[PDB]
Amino acid sequence: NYVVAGYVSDRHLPELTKEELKKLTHINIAFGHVREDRIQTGHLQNLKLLPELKRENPDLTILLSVGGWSAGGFSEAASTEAGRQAMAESAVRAVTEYALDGVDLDWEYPCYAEAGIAASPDDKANFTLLLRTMREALDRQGERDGRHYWLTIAAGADQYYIDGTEMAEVQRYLDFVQLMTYDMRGGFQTLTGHHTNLYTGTGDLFRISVDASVNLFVRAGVPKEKIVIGAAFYSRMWKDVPNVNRGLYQMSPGSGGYGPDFTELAAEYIDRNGFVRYWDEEAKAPYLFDGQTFISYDDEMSIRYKCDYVKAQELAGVMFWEYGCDRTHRLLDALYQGL
Amino acid sequence: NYVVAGYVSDRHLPELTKEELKKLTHINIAFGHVREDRIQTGHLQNLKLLPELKRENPDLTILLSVGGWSAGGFSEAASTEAGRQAMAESAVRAVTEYALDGVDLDWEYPCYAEAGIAASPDDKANFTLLLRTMREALDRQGERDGRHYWLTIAAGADQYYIDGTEMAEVQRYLDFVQLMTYDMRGGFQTLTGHHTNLYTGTGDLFRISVDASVNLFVRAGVPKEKIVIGAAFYSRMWKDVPNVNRGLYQMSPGSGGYGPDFTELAAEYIDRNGFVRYWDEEAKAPYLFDGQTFISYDDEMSIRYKCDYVKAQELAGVMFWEYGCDRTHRLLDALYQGL
Fold it and tell me: How many Å lie between the alpha carbon of A36 and the closest alpha carbon of chain B?
C-alpha cells in the first residue's frame, strides 16, 4: 500500500465523488490559518461534510492543512512556549470539533520570510519544539479517544529547507513528510526549467528535482518510508523567452509565474494554438513551447514515472496539489493506477 | 606569498601604473575569443605594451584570458580531437607572438548554454581532454623556451559547475583554479541577495557563498593551494523591491542586473541620494537600500574578510573583476594590504 494524498481546498470538498474518494488514502484540506498563535477554522465552509466523506471511504484519512504560501503567524507562535502550547491546543480543538484525523502543518518555511511572513534564525530549533508539542497534544487526545491522530508537514524541496530545519529530529514526530516537489523553479528565477521534474537534467544551472530532493532529505535523516513526493496538477510559465533549445534553459525578462492548470492545458495548450509538447527523456518531464512562451507541467506520463520511482526507491507515496486543478480527472486516475 | 590576480581589459592596459603593477602577482587580459577552434587575438589592441609592464614588475605573470560570458566556440572546439589540438596550438601561438606567460580559459560553462553559446553533455569529459591537450602543448613550448607557461581557468561557483566538469581531473593540468565567487546571485533570479558574499546568510533561499563554493570545489578534489577566490569591483542590483527587511531577500519583478561599478557607488550611492549602507554581519557583505532599489557589492571591509579567510583556510589567493571598475584605487589597495 502507498499514500495517495490529495490537497483539496475547502471550497472543492462538495465536488468529491465516491469514486474519487476510493482512490485516495488521504485528503489534505487547504487551509486553516494561524491567528493569535492558534489554528483558525472559522473561515472554512464545508467541514460539516467530513462524516459523509468518511462514510463513503472508511479507509480515508482527512487532515487539516494549516498555512500555505504567505500564511503568517508561524514564526511568532513557535517563538514562545506559550505559542507552541496554543498551536497544540488548537490542533486538538480542530480534531474534536470536526471529523478531522489530524493536522498537516504547511509553514513555508522555518527561517524564511520570502513569502511575506515573519521569520527568524531561531525557527530552526523552534520548529522542532513546535511539532513535538503538537504531537504530544494530539497523542494525548488520541489516548482519550482510543485512536491515532496524525501529524504531517509539507516541506520545501531544496537545500534551503534542510538548512532551516532539523529534519532528523522533526521526522520523529510525524507520520510522514510531504516533499513539495513542485514550484521547484518558479517565481524566484528568470531561467526556464521544469517545476516538478523527477530527475535533474543536463545543462540546467538549477540542480533540484524529485530525485535530488529525496536524496537531500534521506541524507538529512528522514526515513524513506516517511517520504511522500509531490505531483502538480498545474503549470509554471515563463514569457518572452528566446526561441532556442525549444525554450528550455532560456532567460525570460520575468520569473516563472503560475501557468494554466491541467484543465486549461488540456483544453487550450497541449499540441494546440502553436504550442508543441516536448518530452525531456532525462528529467522525465513534459513541457510546451510555441517559440516564445515556455510551460512546465506534470502529465500522466511523468506521473507514471514518479510512481515507478516511489516503488523502486521504497518511498511512502505521492501527494498532489490540487484536486480542482484537473477537471479531466485523468491525473488522479494515473496516480491511482501507478500506485 | 599569495596570488593577487586582476582581470584587466585590453582597453585598460595603458592605464596600469608601476605602483599598481607592483601590487599584483598576475594580470588576466580580457579577452581573447574562439573562432575556427582557435584562440584569436587580432581584435586586442595593447598587447605590444606587455614587455614594458613586465619590466616594471619582473615578478608579474601575465595571462591571456580566453572567453568570458557569451563567448562561444568552446563546446565546438572541445568536441573533436582536431579542435582540442587547434586550441592548444593557438595557445602556443599566443605565448610566442606576445609577451604572455600563459592562458586563462574562461568557458562559461562546460555543459551550459545559458549564455547563448553551444553546449553538450559531452562537454564534461571534453573539457578535461581540452585542458590536458592545451597543457601538453604549453609544456612543450616551455621546454623549448626554457621556462614555465601557465594554464588556469575561471570556474563557476555553484553546484552546476561541479556537475558539468571533472574537477579532480581538471585541476591536475592547472596552476590554479579561479572561483568566480561573484554574480552568484544576479541575472537568473528575482530574489535579492549578496552577489559576492563570503558566507551564506540565514533566511536566503539561495545557499551559495565563497565559503560554500570553496567547500564544493575542495570536496570535488581541487587542492586548497590551487583555489583562488573572487572579489567584485562592481555591484548587482534589483529594482522595485518591497521595503521589507532592508530590501534583503525580497522579490523584484526583474532579475539582478548589473548595478553601478565601485567608482559610481562611491560617488553616487554609498550613504548618499537616499541609499543607506547596511552591513550583513553573517555574510560579511555590505549592501545598499533606499526603500526600493537594492544593491549588492564588495568593499574594503568585505575584501579584508575575504583575505583573512584565504589566510586562515590556506587558499592560494584572490582575483578580481575588473581593474577599470574602481577608479578610486581603494579596492586593489585593500586586497594588496590584506594578503
Answer: 22
A119 touches chain B (CB under 8 A): yes
Return the SS3 of A92. Answer: helix
The CATH number given to whatever domain includes residue A243 is 3.10.50.10
- Residue B101: CATH number of its domain: 3.20.20.80
Tell me if A113 and B160 make a contact (CB, 8 A cut-off). no
Please give the interface size between A and B, counted as residue pairs whose CB atoms are below 8 Å apart: 87
Q: Does B281 touch chain A (CB under 8 A)?
A: no
Residue of B nearest to A158 (CA): B205
Structure determination method? X-ray
Amino acid at B216: L
**In a shared domain, residues A179 and A248:** no
Task: Please spell the DSSP secondary structure of B123-149, one letter per residue.
Answer: HHHHHHHHHHHHHHHHHHHHHHHTS--
First and final CA of chain B: distance in angstroms? 8
Known catalytic residues of A?
108
Cβ-nearest to B114 among A159, A163, A205: A205
CB-based contact A203 B163, cutoff 8 Å: no
Q: Looking at chain A, how many residues does it have?
A: 339
Same domain, yes or no: A143 and A225: yes
Amino acid at B260: P
Look at the block and give the residue holding cell 579542435: B83
Q: Cα–Cα distance between A165 and A258 in angstroms, integer? A: 27
Cell numbers describing residue B153: 581557468
Tell the residue number behind the cell numbers 489554528, with chain if given.
A39
Backbone CA torsion sign across A128, A44, A61, A28: negative
The amino acid sitting at B240 is D
Shortest CA distance from B254: residue in chain A: A254
Mark whether B178 and B269 lie in a shared domain: no
Q: How far off is chain B from A199, nearest CA to CA, in Å?
A: 14
Name the domain count of chain A.
Answer: 2
- Residue partners of B310: CB distance under 8 A and separation at least 6: B2, B229, B316, B317, B318, B339
B208 touches chain A (CB under 8 A): no
**Structural domain containing residue B83:** 1-232+298-339
Q: Are residues B260 and B149 in the same domain?
A: no
Nearest CA to CA, how far is A17 from chain B (Å)?
Answer: 39
- Same domain? B100 vs B25: yes
Active-site pick, B20, B36, B89, B108: B108
Q: How far is A113 from chain B (nearest CA, A)?
A: 7
Report CA-CA distances (Å) from B309 to B213, B244, B284, B313.
Answer: 13, 31, 11, 6
Q: To the nearest 10°, report the CA torsion of B199, B202, B203, B207.
A: 40
Of A111, A158, A245, the CB nearest to B202: A111
Question: Are both A187 and A136 inside the same structural domain?
Answer: yes
The number of helices, as runs of H, and strands, as runs of E, in chain B is 11, 14
Q: Which residue, among A99, A91, A10, A97, has the nearest Cα to A61 in the 3D structure?
A: A99
- Provide the β-strand partners of residue A92: none
Query: What span, in angstroms and rounded, lies between the C-alpha atoms of B317 and B56?
Result: 22
**Packed helices B123-145 and B81-97: angle between N→C axes, nearest 10 degrees:** 40
Residue listed under C-alpha cell 621556462: B147
Looking at residue B235, the DSSP 8-state letter turns out to be E
Domain co-membership, A142 together with A271? no
Which residues of chain B have a CB within 8 Å of the CB of A189?
Answer: 188-190
Are A223 and A242 within one domain? no
Whether B281 sits among the annotated catalytic residues: the reply is no
Q: Which residue does chain A place closest to B189, by CA atoms?
A: A189
For this experimental structure, what is the resolution in angstroms?
1.4
